[PDB]
């Protein structure tokens, strides 16, 4: 179940966030913690491609080696708050699971600056969801969370100390695929 109406950053700068570059998940918190593994790798690219607002996602379970990419077209609900219907693709953008009704996620950018961000997502895959999932992002895959984003976590009435880090999982990412998937 998802339970939070995440508030987007006041003054969110969409063009900076959606600049075509990659964001790495460095830390995450699911309010239903058993919905996701305790060790995980994830990253995304976010950009406009030929006028269309896009995200490309990468997920990797470093223990099971379960790997998948997704491409999403985002619709705007309000500044910094989106609804994304996804298609599962291979790394080259070939469709494995087409877009469908019931497969979507909400995506809210709660905090962002040039190097860091705090997001919320609620994933729906038919009548299943993956709970309220918060993620701390950085442009540098190895960056420890700094005070701007940790303060944003606090401002969301969350505690950064409860977030699970992705840093001890030997995560390795194909940035080229993420960037190229924005066009697909
Ligand atoms: C950064 C933001 C994220 C977004 C927007 C997001 C989005 C999604 C989407 C769209 C899917 C479905 C993929 C498909 O079936 O084609 C998915 C699945 C999944 N995500 Fe995330 N995700 C994010 C971060 C994470 C993180 C950090 C974890 C942490 C553990 C995670 C764990 C999972 C798992 C375990 C699944 C598989 C669900 C199932 O098998 O049905 N995700 N995610």
From Swiss-Prot:
Salivary gland (at protein level). Belongs to the calycin superfamily. Nitrophorin family. Its main location: secreted. Binds 1 heme b (iron(II)-protoporphyrin IX) group per subunit. Disulfide bonds join 2-122, 41-171. It holds the Pfam family Nitrophorin. It comes from Rhodnius prolixus. InterPro entries: Calycin, Nitrophorin, Nitrophorin_domain. Changing residue 130 to R: Coordination of the heme iron center and inhibition of nitrite disproportionation. Heme binds at residue 59. Superposition of the structures of NP4 in the presence of ammonia or nitrite shows a conformational change of the protein upon NO(2)(-) binding. It comes from the Eukaryota. This is Nitrophorin-4. The keyword Methyltransferase does not apply. It is found in: Secreted. Its cofactor is heme b. GO terms for cellular component: extracellular region. Its EC number is 1.7.6.1. GO terms for biological process: vasodilation. Gene3D superfamilies: 2.40.128.20.
């Amino acid at each position: 179940a998802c339970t939070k109406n995440a508030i987007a950053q006041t003054g969110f700068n969409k063009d900076k966030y959606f600049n075509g570059d990659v964001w790495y998940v460095t830390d995450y918190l699911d309010l239903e913690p058993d919905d996701v593994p305790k060790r995980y790798c994830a990253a995304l690219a976010a950009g406009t491609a030929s006028g269309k607002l896009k995200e490309a996602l990468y997920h990797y379970d470093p223990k099971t080696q379960d790997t998948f990419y997704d491409v999403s077209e985002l619709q705007v609900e309000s500044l910094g708050k989106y609804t994304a219907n996804f298609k599962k693709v291979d790394k080259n953008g070939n469709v494995k699971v087409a877009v469908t009704a019931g497969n979507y996620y909400t995506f809210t950018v709660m905090y962002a600056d040039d190097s860091s961000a705090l997001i919320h997502t609620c994933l729906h895959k038919g009548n299943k969801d993956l709970g309220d999932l918060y993620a701390v992002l950085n442009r540098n895959k190895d960056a420890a969370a700094g005070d701007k984003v940790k303060s944003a976590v606090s401002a969301a009435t969350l505690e950064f100390s409860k977030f699970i880090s992705t840093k001890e999982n030997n995560c390795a990412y194909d940035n080229d695929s993420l960037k190229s998937l924005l066009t697909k």
